[PDB]
Structure 1
Amino acid sequence: ITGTSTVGVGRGVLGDQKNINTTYSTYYYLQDNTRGNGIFTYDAKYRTTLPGSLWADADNQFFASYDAPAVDAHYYAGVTYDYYKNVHNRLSYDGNNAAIRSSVHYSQGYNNAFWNGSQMVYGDGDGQTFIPLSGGIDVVAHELTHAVTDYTAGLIYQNESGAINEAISDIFGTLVEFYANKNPDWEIGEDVYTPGISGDSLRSMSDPAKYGDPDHYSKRYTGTQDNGGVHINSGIINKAAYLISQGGTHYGVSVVGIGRDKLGKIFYRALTQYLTPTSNFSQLRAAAVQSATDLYGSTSQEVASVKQAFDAVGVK
């Protein structure tokens, strides 16, 4: 809507207080005009009809329990936008400042979040497996990254290309978590997963096997479930990304880490310049090697580490 830009205050899913950009026009709306064509957050009101109603508040104060998921979805979308703009010089997910829209309170006891091709959607969780999903910055970044992938490489959501699609979202979801310096780690969804159990997460990039996911190509899932194991085989790529950044010895192969910043630069270039809709793991390796070559030279330590990491996970 058309109004005056202002700043409100609220509390997120985890009970933390934060300032959020709103717009005033009779009501205060969750509309951030400071980033691109705007960030809009909607109330799905426990229904499945999208996007729902643009979030309206009477006093610009968002401390109600019902407000929490909206505060975080709105705020973290902003952080993710800042990451892509400041670190990769990319304006929104389409590179042309497309408006970012998110709907919260989707359905009832919905343990999932997703990009539906046009916007982000967040369930509130069942309170046992998950609490409102927008409470996790890596979750929000994971979802917004699916949009970036759709507008760039366009990786098909099936089999190996789908696993790469998933890994890319976990990788950048994690880099954004580090960017915001919000208790950063190489785990996925730890902030909103199983509130009754501490120390766990949905997936682990440092050690995928911890939750039963493969950490080597020889252990890849070949079945038909989960679109060919897109959320399972992503572990192979996640492990490779972790090794490239942090280094380590995996299955007898030693990798010298080059850090998170270079990891981001290498994968972002691969994603936007070399990957295609049907790229498989082997092609991802080639794309990553070429990207590192473009950025640091064919005889650089960076290229060496990328090669070692993929060798470690059995991807030739």
Structure 2
Amino acid sequence: ITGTSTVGVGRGVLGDQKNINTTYSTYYYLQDNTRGNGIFTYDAKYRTTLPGSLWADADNQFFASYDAPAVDAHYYAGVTYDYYKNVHNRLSYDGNNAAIRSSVHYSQGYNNAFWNGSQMVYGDGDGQTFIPLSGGIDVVAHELTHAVTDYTAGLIYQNESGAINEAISDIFGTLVEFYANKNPDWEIGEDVYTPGISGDSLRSMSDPAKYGDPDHYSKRYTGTQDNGGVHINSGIINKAAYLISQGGTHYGVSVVGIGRDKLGKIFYRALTQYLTPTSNFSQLRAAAVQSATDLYGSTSQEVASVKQAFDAVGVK
């Protein structure tokens, strides 16, 4: 909407206070004009029609329980925009400052979040499996990264290309979590998953097997559930990424870690310059090796470490 840029204040899903960029015109709207062509947050009102209504508030204060998922979707979309711009020189998900839209309060007891081709969508959870999913910065960045992938590599959402698609969202979700630097880790969704159980998460990149996912190509799922295991086989690539960054010895194969920033550079380049809609795991290895070669040189430690990591997870 047309109005003047303002700054509201509220509390997120985890009870933390934060400032949010809003727009004033009669009401204060969750419309952040400070980033690209805007970040817009909508209320789906427990229904499934999208996007719903642009979030409007009478007083620019967002401390109601109902407000919390909107505060976090809006704010974490901002952090994710900043990560892509500042770290990768990418302007929004399309590279041309496309407006970023999110809807919260989607459906009832909805234990998921997604990118629907046009916008991000967040359930509130059922209160047992999840609390409102926008409360996780890794979750918000995971979802926005699906948009980046769709605009770039275009990885088809099934089988190996789909597992790469998923891993890319977990990798950048995690790198954004480290960028914001609040309780960062290599787990996915820990801030919003199972409020009654401490110390767990939806997936682990450092040890995918902890939550039942493969950490070696020999253990890949080849059935039809989950679009051919896109959230399962992602563990193989997540493990490789973790090893590239942090190092380790995995099934007897030692990897020298090169750190998160270089992991991010290598995978961002692979995603945007080398991967295609049908890339498989072997092709991702080749894309990552070439990306590291471009950035650091063929004889670099960075290239050697990428090879070691894919060796460790059984991807040739």
Smaller-chain TM-score range? over 0.9
**In structure 2, what is the Cα distance between the partners aligned to 1:105 and 1:182?**
25
**In structure 2, what is the Cα distance between the partners aligned to 1:71 and 1:182?**
17
| 1:209-245 CA distance string (max 9 Å, x none) | 0011000000000101100000000000000000000
**In structure 1, what is the Cα distance between the partners aligned to 2:212 and 2:51?**
35
- How far off is 1:118 after superposition? 0.1
- How far off is 1:250 after superposition? 0.2
- How far off is 1:156 after superposition? 0.1
**In structure 1, what is the Cα distance between the partners aligned to 2:164 and 2:9?**
38
Q: Where in structure 2 are the equivalents of 1:1-316 lying within 5 Å?
A: 1-316=1-316
**In structure 2, what is the Cα distance between the partners aligned to 1:32 and 1:313?**
42
| 1:29-81 CA distance string (max 9 Å, x none) | 00000000000000000000000000000000000000000000000000000
- How far off is 1:260 after superposition? 0.1
**In structure 1, what is the Cα distance between the partners aligned to 2:275 and 2:215?**
22
- How far off is 1:295 after superposition? 0.3
Give the aligned CA root-mean-square deviation in angstroms.
0.2
Question: Scaled by the length of structure 1, what TM-score is found?
Answer: 1.00
**In structure 1, what is the Cα distance between the partners aligned to 2:70 and 2:255?**
41
- How far off is 1:182 after superposition? 1.3
Q: Percent identity?
A: 100
- How far off is 1:248 after superposition? 0.4
SS at match of 2:66: helix
SS at match of 1:153: coil
| 1:74-100 CA distance string (max 9 Å, x none) | 000000000000000000000000000
Question: Where in structure 1 do 4 or more consecutive aligned residues deviate above 4 Å?
Answer: none
How many residue pairs are counted as aligned between the two chains? 316
- How far off is 1:282 after superposition? 0.1
- How far off is 1:108 after superposition? 0.3
**In structure 2, what is the Cα distance between the partners aligned to 1:56 and 1:192?**
25
Q: Give structure 2 stretches of 5+ with no counterpart.
A: none
| 1:160-203 CA distance string (max 9 Å, x none) | 00000000000000000000001000000000000000000000
**In structure 2, what is the Cα distance between the partners aligned to 1:248 and 1:50?**
44
Question: Scaled by the length of structure 2, what TM-score is found?
Answer: 1.00
| 1:231-290 CA distance string (max 9 Å, x none) | 000000000000000000000000000000000000000000000000000000000000
**In structure 2, what is the Cα distance between the partners aligned to 1:128 and 1:212?**
20
**In structure 1, what is the Cα distance between the partners aligned to 2:225 and 2:194?**
24
**In structure 1, what is the Cα distance between the partners aligned to 2:251 and 2:110?**
38
**In structure 1, what is the Cα distance between the partners aligned to 2:286 and 2:112?**
33
